[PDB]
């Protein structure tokens, strides 16, 4: 099973949709190829490369889109946060005038450890063609947010959606008990084995795996995490005697049951009071996470 | 060192009676007869900053210069005017200077009909009276009107507003407007913002403001030529109905000595029931601000 890196001979164009993105932003990368300069054989590979280390990091979302024509898998697009590689099968050695593409979403990251508004460029390469992408890191805002909800999708895991219940982020004294109800919407399924609590401050500790819930409830006398599996409901109550001077980060991954669903929602309510600031009673903190778009088309003529 | 009380000779206000939004030249004069002016000496001219009558000082910085020597500095702020003297003034013996600047007269009285409230401007120990007039709202249901202004905090750029379909009524023809920005000023594309209110409620500002408006409202197009200073806005009748479009931009002044700034427009609209309008001239003019400061001394 021998292979060839035919990217330098067969790549036609390399398109990147948004040439200017923000830090952590998504980017549509399109690679076009044809056999007008060399016939595509079994083992042939098109390799798409990008900066993987330093101040500019480019992380492609892990997806697998097969190049299929008339029910025959002639190739396959393999996407990895460190590089994309397209491998063709022996089922293509019977087609002529072959021309196709590999379109996928890639996360752009700015890692310049310097103050003030910053712009940094990243050059994605595929064969002869190379494209420049700008990633912007805006100046950091003032840290003054008590409770908020955030969902994440890792380039190393596109099957699960990360959810974060960040409580008392500024280590502030909490005047009331912190109660948060959570309703996970359709298209996904809650995984209990992933549920982890990351307390940071006076009573700092990381609780994860099996005993994760009970370890938190025992260590913080009064605290309660309640999970409904089928309904996808997580109700968490933390006492004020432990909520003060501590940042509670509740993280859980939800297994995607529908890849065709374009975005994922999770609704949450909050009950808290930061000492000095005003109290919150049942305010809705809802967050939406976008899925990943990826395609790989191929045209060919038989006989 | 505040020396306003012991040096101000006369405080003067030009137009005594003005309308709500009018401008007023305020002259201040100081002497050296009642004591020497030194380094760190301050002359303050104060006016009502909040209430029924608000006075807004147009932001300017005019230096007190005598024969190639800047002995003082006069700064105007929408809250007060401070005149600071440098160490270079401690060479002159007989000093007599002035500082005249324009301020905005505002009548914030929220009461029924015509209202006249006096605003008293103070400088040291001298006082003056300014009458501001509110003139009651009308029944003028203008479809398309153009009006610009200059903010007392920003005197370097000129605001211009393109208010389309203000009474958000049914429209029978695609609304088209042409904008011709005149000389002495330059278009700033960053300040160009769109504000939609009515059936559709949106506000697009900065950078991609034009693109975001064109994407969200299919059919609508804003043609901006930067070097020639020409804006052409075309909105389809399907979106132009029941929506008030507010297109505002700032125009950077490239001529501080210019007397007034002009801006022309041509409207193309058919408001259902009323008359058809084809290429009618909707022109507006913004008045410029004049600020002066002069010092007179002898060795």
């Amino acid at each position: 099973g021998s292979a060839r890196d035919i990217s330098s001979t067969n790549v036609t164009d390399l398109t990147v949709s948004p040439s200017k993105i923000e830090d952590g932003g998504k980017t549509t990368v399109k690679m076009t190829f044809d056999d007008k300069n060399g016939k595509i054989q079994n083992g042939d590979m098109i390799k798409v490369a990008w900066p993987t280390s330093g101040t500019v990091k480019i992380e492609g979302y892990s997806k697998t889109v097969p190049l299929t024509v008339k029910g025959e898998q002639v190739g396959q697009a393999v996407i990895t946060p460190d590089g994309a590689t397209i491998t063709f099968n022996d089922k293509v050695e019977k087609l002529s005038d072959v021309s196709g593409f590999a379109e996928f979403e890639v996360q752009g990251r700015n890692l310049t450890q310097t103050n003030t508004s910053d712009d940094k460029v990243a050059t994605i390469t595929s064969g002869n063609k190379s494209t420049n992408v700008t990633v912007h890191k805006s100046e950091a805002g003032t840290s003054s947010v008590f409770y908020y909800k955030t969902g994440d999708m890792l380039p190393e895991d596109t099957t699960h959606v990360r959810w974060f219940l960040n409580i008392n982020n500024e280590k502030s004294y909490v005047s009331k008990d912190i109660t948060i109800k959570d309703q996970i919407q359709g298209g996904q399924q809650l995984d209990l084995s992933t549920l982890n609590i990351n307390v940071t401050g006076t009573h700092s500790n990381y609780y994860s795996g099996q005993s994760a819930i009970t370890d938190f409830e025992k260590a913080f006398p009064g605290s309660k995490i309640t999970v409904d599996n089928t309904k996808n409901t997580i109700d968490v109550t933390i006492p004020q005697g432990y909520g003060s001077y501590n940042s509670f980060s509740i993280n859980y991954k939800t297994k995607i049951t529908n890849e065709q669903q374009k975005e994922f929602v999770n609704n949450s309510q909050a009950w808290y009071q930061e000492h000095g600031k005003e109290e919150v009673n049942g305010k809705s903190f809802n967050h939406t996470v976008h899925n990943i778009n990826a395609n790989a088309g191929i045209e060919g003529t038989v006989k | 060192r505040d020396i306003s009380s012991t040096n101000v000779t006369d405080l003067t206000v030009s137009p005594s009676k003005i309308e709500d939004g009018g401008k007023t030249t305020v002259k201040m004069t100081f002497d050296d007869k009642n004591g020497k002016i030194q380094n760190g000496d301050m002359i303050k001219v104060a006016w009502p900053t909040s209430g029924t009558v608000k006075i807004e000082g147009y932001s300017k910085t005019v230096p007190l210069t005598v024969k190639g020597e800047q002995v003082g500095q006069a700064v105007i702020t929408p809250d007060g005017a401070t005149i600071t003297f440098n160490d270079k003034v401690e060479k002159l013996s007989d000093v007599s200077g002035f500082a005249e600047f324009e301020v905005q007269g505002r009548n914030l009285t929220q009461t029924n009909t015509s209202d006249d409230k006096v605003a008293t401007i103070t400088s040291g120990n001298k006082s003056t009276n300014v009458t501001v007039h509110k003139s009651e709202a009308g029944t003028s249901s203008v479809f398309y009107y153009k009006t610009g202004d200059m903010l007392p905090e920003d005197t370097t750029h000129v605001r211009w507003f393109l208010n389309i379909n203000n009474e958000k009524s049914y429209v029978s023809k695609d609304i088209t407007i042409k904008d011709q920005i005149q000389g002495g000023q330059q278009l700033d594309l960053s300040t160009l913002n769109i504000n939609v209110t009515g059936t559709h409620s949106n506000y697009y500002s900065g950078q991609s403001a034009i693109t975001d408006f064109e994407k969200a409202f299919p059919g609508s197009k804003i043609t901006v030529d930067n070097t020639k200073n020409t804006i052409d806005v075309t909105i389809p009748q399907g979106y132009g109905s029941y929506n008030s479009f507010s297109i505002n931009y700032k125009t950077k002044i490239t001529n501080e000595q210019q007397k007034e700034f002009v801006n022309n427009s041509q409207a193309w609209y058919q408001e259902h029931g009323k008359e058809e309008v084809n290429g009618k001239s909707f022109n507006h003019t913004v008045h410029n601000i004049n600020a002066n400061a002069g010092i007179e001394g002898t060795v």
């Binding site: 952590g24 805006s138 100046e139 950091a140 805002g141 003032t142 840290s143 003054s144 947010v145 955030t150 974060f164 960040n166 982020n169 982890n196 990351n198 940071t200 990381y206 994860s208 795996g209 980060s249 993280n251 | 939004g21 003139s135 009651e136 709202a137 009308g138 029944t139 003028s140 203008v142 009006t147 605001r159 507003f161 208010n163 203000n166 913002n193 504000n195 506000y203 500002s205 900065g206 507010s246 505002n248």
Partner: peptide, 30 residues
């Protein structure tokens, strides 16, 4: 042994784009 906790939440976003210019004033008389 066991791997570490997930990283600390990133620096909060920028600042909201300045509000729209206010509503137009009352119409004038004669």
């Amino acid at each position: 042994g066991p791997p570490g906790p997930p990283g600390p939440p990133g620096p909060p976003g920028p600042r909201g784009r300045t509000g729209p210019p206010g509503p137009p004033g009352p119409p004038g008389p004669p």
